[PDB]
């Protein structure tokens, strides 16, 4: 995250961190339930074998409430391709269930029509992650969050060099130099509704980070609710 604010105690409890063999965070994830993590399909190419870290806010200090989970099943969308970045979604089933506690809790999965008419129409959402704090930088050791305005679909398509499919949405600022960045990929974009946070997006990609006239591109979670529901039964 470039700009924004640190996630304080209990503020971003749905955040998961994908960790390689070297125990370094490379992508984010969203806790959907005790056995399932939502992430980006493209994250699965960033490491041969990876684990899931939950309840982590600072990667330098062991947090007690912090836990490492092994992946049992990787459920990747067969339609994902590096050429388009379309269908940038994957579901992970863990070997052991997550213990919910302070800093560990799932985000809600909304119903499709309501998310589209009610969540997607709010002014903003919140993106969070351990990604780079500047376009050229190292992975943050602190979990950050940033409030990001929903971006008009037409402005989104015009801002981009690449095709913005119907499985994608824009969020961010045109002038303000704050946005998600590399390493935030797979992480949550949640929308608050009456003090309840619903997962609305998956950090997917962007042309640089926090660049003027550019936005963060997210996998639209609503386009995959049935596929997510199905994945959780298998």
């Amino acid at each position: 995250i470039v700009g924004g604010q640190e996630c304080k105690d209990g503020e971003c409890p749905w955040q998961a961190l994908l960790i390689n063999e070297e125990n370094e965070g490379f992508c984010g994830g969203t806790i959907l339930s005790e056995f399932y993590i939502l992430t980006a399909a493209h994250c699965l190419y960033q490491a041969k074998r990876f684990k899931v870290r939950v309840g982590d806010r600072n990667t330098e200090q062991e947090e007690g409430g912090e836990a490492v989970h092994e992946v049992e099943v990787v459920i990747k969308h067969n339609r994902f391709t590096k050429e388009t970045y379309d269908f940038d979604i994957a579901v992970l089933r863990l070997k052991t269930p997550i213990t919910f506690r302070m800093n560990v809790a799932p985000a809600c999965l909304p119903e499709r029509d309501w998310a589209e008419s009610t969540l997607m129409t709010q002014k903003t959402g919140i993106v969070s992650g351990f990604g780079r704090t500047h376009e050229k930088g190292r992975q943050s050791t602190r979990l950050k969050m940033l409030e990001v305005p929903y971006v008009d679909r037409n402005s989104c398509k015009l801002s981009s060099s690449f095709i913005i499919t119907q499985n994608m949405f824009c969020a961010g600022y045109d002038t303000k130099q704050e946005d998600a960045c590399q390493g935030d990929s797979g992480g949550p974009h949640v929308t608050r509704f009456k003090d309840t946070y619903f997962v609305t997006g998956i950090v997917s990609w962007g042309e640089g980070c926090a660049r003027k006239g550019k936005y963060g591109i997210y996998t639209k979670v609503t386009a995959f609710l049935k596929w997510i529901d199905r994945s959780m039964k298998t």
């Binding site: 209990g10 409890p13 506690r101 809790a105 985000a107 809600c108 309501w114 009456k194 003090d195 309840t196």
Partner: protein
């Protein structure tokens, strides 16, 4: 207006059935007696910050 008027006073999901508001909740919540609020079934319900 129904669901367009302040989410039909629902806490969460608002649906329209026979020109009437029908509220529902995500998993881990039970719809309240007033048929509008969503009550957590146990500790750590989805979407709640753990600030306490």
């Amino acid at each position: 207006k129904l669901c367009s008027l302040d989410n039909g006073d629902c806490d969460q999901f608002c649906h329209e059935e026979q020109n009437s508001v029908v509220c529902s909740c995500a998993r881990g919540y039970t719809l309240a007696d007033n048929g509008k609020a969503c009550i957590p079934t146990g500790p750590y319900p989805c979407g709640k910050q753990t600030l306490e």
